[PDB]
Amino acid sequence: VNSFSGYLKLTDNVYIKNADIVEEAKKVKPTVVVNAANVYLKHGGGVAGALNKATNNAMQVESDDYIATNGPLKVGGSCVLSGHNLAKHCLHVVGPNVNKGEDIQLLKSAYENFNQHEVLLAPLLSAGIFGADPIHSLRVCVDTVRTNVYLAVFDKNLYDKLVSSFL
Numbered sequence: 001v002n003s004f005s006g007y008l009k010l011t012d013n014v015y016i017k018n019a020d021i022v023e024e025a026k027k028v029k030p031t032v033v034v035n036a037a038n039v040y041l042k043h044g045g046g047v048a049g050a051l052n053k054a055t056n057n058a059m060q061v062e063s064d065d066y067i068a069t070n071g072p073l074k075v076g077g078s079c080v081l082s083g084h085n086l087a088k089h090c091l092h093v094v095g096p097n098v099n100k101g102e103d104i105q106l107l108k109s110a111y112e113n114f115n116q117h118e119v120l121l122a123p124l125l126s127a128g129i130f131g132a133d134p135i136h137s138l139r140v141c142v143d144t145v146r147t148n149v150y151l152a153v154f155d156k157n158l159y160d161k162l163v164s165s166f167l
């Protein structure tokens with residue numbers, strides 16, 4: 001038993017809800033919140049911009065030190081950093097950005113990072129300003145993640161479409 005509330009159960013381990021991941025993180029304080037990151041950890045907009053704003057830019061400060069030491073992530077890769085006031089940890093995961101021309105096949109590799117964590121709160125990878133089809137992202141999530149994932153979908157209209165079309 002965990003503290004997530006109001007989710008629809010899609011499969012044995014995948015759950016979905018119309019919610020703002022920022023507000024959801026601030027209430028649940030999950031062990032792991034997933035950020036929709038880029039390889040430079042520049043958290044300017046989309047989910048990443050919103051999570052960082054909620055940390056009063058502390059996420060960005062930590063991220064800049066990480067990149068200065070380690071260099072950029074790989075598309076499809078991840079790193080674990082602090083969750084600041086939102087979660088114990090933040091798993092920064094880089095899904096392909098279609099608006100940059102990146103290979104959509106890398107979306108499965110991106111979701112594989114979730115399997116290193118028993119329970120996670122997450123957005124749909126590569127959705128939103130990353131340009132991928134969210135219905136496809138949900139399909140890849142369900143077919144790749146085996147640990148317990150709680151998906152927060154900000155847009156109410158998109159959520160209903162995701163549910164109604166889920167096979």
Ligand SMILES: Cc1[nH]c2ncnc(NC(=O)CC(C)(C)C)c2c1C
Pocket residue numbers: 019020021022046047050123124127128129134152153154155158
């Ligand atoms: C600030 C914020 N918070 C979120 N929490 C969960 N999911 C999110 N993204 C989407 O739902 C996909 C789109 C944007 C509807 C296509 C977001 C965003 C952009």
